[PDB]
Design an enzyme around this catalytic site. Sequence first.
Site, PDB file in Angstrom:
ATOM      1  N   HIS C  43      -4.028   2.826   0.207  1.00  0.00           N
ATOM      2  CA  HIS C  43      -3.497   2.905  -1.152  1.00  0.00           C
ATOM      3  C   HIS C  43      -4.433   2.357  -2.241  1.00  0.00           C
ATOM      4  O   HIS C  43      -4.253   2.657  -3.412  1.00  0.00           O
ATOM      5  CB  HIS C  43      -2.061   2.361  -1.255  1.00  0.00           C
ATOM      6  CG  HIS C  43      -1.948   0.925  -1.644  1.00  0.00           C
ATOM      7  ND1 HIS C  43      -1.630  -0.057  -0.729  1.00  0.00           N
ATOM      8  CD2 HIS C  43      -2.046   0.310  -2.849  1.00  0.00           C
ATOM      9  CE1 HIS C  43      -1.536  -1.216  -1.358  1.00  0.00           C
ATOM     10  NE2 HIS C  43      -1.802  -1.025  -2.639  1.00  0.00           N
ATOM     11  N   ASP C  99      -1.129   2.248   6.166  1.00  0.00           N
ATOM     12  CA  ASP C  99      -1.893   1.978   4.943  1.00  0.00           C
ATOM     13  C   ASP C  99      -3.275   1.461   5.338  1.00  0.00           C
ATOM     14  O   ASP C  99      -3.487   0.250   5.419  1.00  0.00           O
ATOM     15  CB  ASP C  99      -1.148   0.960   4.079  1.00  0.00           C
ATOM     16  CG  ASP C  99      -1.659   0.905   2.641  1.00  0.00           C
ATOM     17  OD1 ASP C  99      -2.572   1.681   2.263  1.00  0.00           O
ATOM     18  OD2 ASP C  99      -1.142   0.048   1.892  1.00  0.00           O
ATOM     19  N   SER C 198      -4.519  -6.249  -2.256  1.00  0.00           N
ATOM     20  CA  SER C 198      -4.336  -5.192  -1.235  1.00  0.00           C
ATOM     21  C   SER C 198      -5.658  -4.756  -0.675  1.00  0.00           C
ATOM     22  O   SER C 198      -6.680  -4.785  -1.386  1.00  0.00           O
ATOM     23  CB  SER C 198      -3.605  -3.970  -1.815  1.00  0.00           C
ATOM     24  OG  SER C 198      -2.264  -4.291  -2.067  1.00  0.00           O
TER      25      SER C 198
END
EC number: 3.4.21.5
Lengths: 27, 11, 250
Positions: C43, C99, C198
Site C-alpha cells: 500500500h 500488504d 507503513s
Amino acid sequence: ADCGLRPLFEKKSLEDKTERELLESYI
Amino acid sequence: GDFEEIPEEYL
Amino acid sequence: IVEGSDAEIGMSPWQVMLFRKSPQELLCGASLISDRWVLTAAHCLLYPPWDKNFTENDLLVRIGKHSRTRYERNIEKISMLEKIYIHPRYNWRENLDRDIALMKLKKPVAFSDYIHPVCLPDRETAASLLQAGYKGRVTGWGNLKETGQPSVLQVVNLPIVERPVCKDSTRIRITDNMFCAGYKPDEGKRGDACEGDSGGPFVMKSPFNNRWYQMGIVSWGEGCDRDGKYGFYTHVFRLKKWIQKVIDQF
Ligand SMILES: COc1cc(C(=O)N2CCOC(C)(C)C2)cc2nc(NCc3cccc(Cl)c3)oc12
Ligand SMILES: *[C@@H]1O[C@H](CO)[C@@H](O)[C@H](O)[C@H]1NC(C)=O
C-alpha cells in the site's frame, strides 16, 4: 549468512537499551 | 522543503 | 511512531526510508533484506482509494539513516529502484490482505556499521516466536501523534496480541496473513505505529541464535495508539513463498 547481526551491537557483543524487554517476553 | 536537499547525482 | 523513543545509533541498520521525489517527502518505511532487495508494504506503492500508484522513477531508497530530514553525508546511502514487485493477490480493495511488496535496487548497496540486512523467518522461527505476549520492535520516521514529526528514527517494543482479541477490536476482516500487536487498555503501557511508518519492520530477536528476524511489516491501524485498537502487521513468514519466488526469478 550474517543477516540480523548488527555491526554496532551483536557483532561487538553490545546490547541495546531495550532488547532485554523482548527477551523477558519470550517466556 | 522540510527535507535537506539531496546531492544532484541521486536525482 | 507514537509513544516510542529515539533509536540508538546503528540500532536498526536494516531500516530503509522510502523517499518521494517532487515532491520531497517521507513515503513509507521499508527494510533491507539483502544487498539488492528491499521489503515494504504494497500500500506504500499502490493504493487506488488514496490515488497512490508509484512507479520506480518516483522514489528513492535511503538506507543507513537516523535523522529524518538531514542528508547524512558519509553515512546514509541513496539507491535507485530497478523494479517494484507487488504481491499479485494484494487486496487493496478491501482489508489490505497480503500488504507486501519487493523492490530490487539498481546497484548493490555496500554494508557498513549503519547498513546491514535483517533475517527473514523460516517456519520454525515463526512457530517459536509469533506467540501472544511475545514482544517485537517497530521502527520508523512516521508521525508522533495521530492528529508532530520526529527529529530521528523512533523505536517502540509491542506485544503480539491473541487472534480473537485482534478480531474483536475491529469490524475489518482479519486474515491469517495478518497479526496484530500493541498494549491493551488495562496494561497501562502505550505505543503504536502511525502515518509514515507503513512498510517498516516489526522485528524480534531470536533467543535461540541471537539474530534479528523481520516477522511483520507495518500495515494499518484505526488511527494511532488508540485505546482498544491495535496495529496490524503483514505476516512475513506466511508470504515467504512469494518472497522466495520473486528473488529466485528476478
Ligand atoms: C491504506 O493504508 C491504511 C488504511 C487505513 C484505514 O483507514 N483503514 C480503514 C479501512 O480499512 C483498512 C484496512 C484499509 C484500514 C489505516 C492505515 N494506517 C496505516 N498506517 C499507519 C499505521 C497506524 C497504526 C498502526 C499501524 Cl500497523 C500502521 O495505513 C493505513
Ligand atoms: C498504475 O500505473 C501503471 C503504470 O503507469 C498503470 O499501468 C496501472 O494500470 C495503474 N494502476 C492503477 C491506477 O490502479
